[PDB]
Amino acid sequence: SCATTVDAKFRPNGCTD
Numbered sequence: 001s002c003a004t005t006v007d008a009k010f011r012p013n014g015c016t017d
Contacts, residue, residue, distance in 0.1 A: 002015035
């Protein structure tokens with residue numbers, strides 16, 4: 001999954017979860 005670790009720099013712009 002795209003959202004896993006809670007940080008603004010972790011998840012990419014337009015990522016597939």
